[PDB]
């Protein structure tokens, strides 16, 4: 049993290290978005970066 | 003025596929104004040089 305790509340930390993921709002692996893009070029072209959820 | 770039005095853009447009639309409002302006700069050089013969 205590090791079944140890086990929940480091997966409840996950949820927290993963949720606080963001930077200015935006977040590549908390999931609320499928990719971001980034500009590549003047014309507006972009950069793409999947998503990675964690 | 704006209508003469191809604006309006209401453009404006309120979401990143709107503002994804407007690049492309102030390109063409850059475009045609440098070529407006370069007829103008035309213009006064031919002004500049018949000043000249008529002297």
């Known amino acids: 049993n205590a090791l079944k305790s140890d086990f929940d509340s480091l997966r409840d930390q996950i949820t927290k290290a993963a949720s606080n993921a963001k ?14 893009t980034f500009l590549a070029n003047s014309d507006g072209s972009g950069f793409t970066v999947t998503a990675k959820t964690l | ?39 103008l700069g035309t213009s006064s050089t031919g002004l500049d040089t018949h000043l000249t013969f008529v002297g």
Not at chain 2, 7 to 33: E, H, N, V, Y
């Open chain 1, 23 to 36: 930077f200015n709002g935006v977040s590549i692996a908390n999931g609320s978005t499928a990719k971001l």
């Open chain 2, 1 to 39: 003025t704006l209508t003469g770039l191809g604006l309006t005095a209401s453009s404006t853009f309120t979401t990143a596929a709107a503002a994804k447009t407007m690049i492309g639309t102030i390109d063409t409002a850059l475009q045609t104004a440098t070529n407006k302006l370069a007829s």
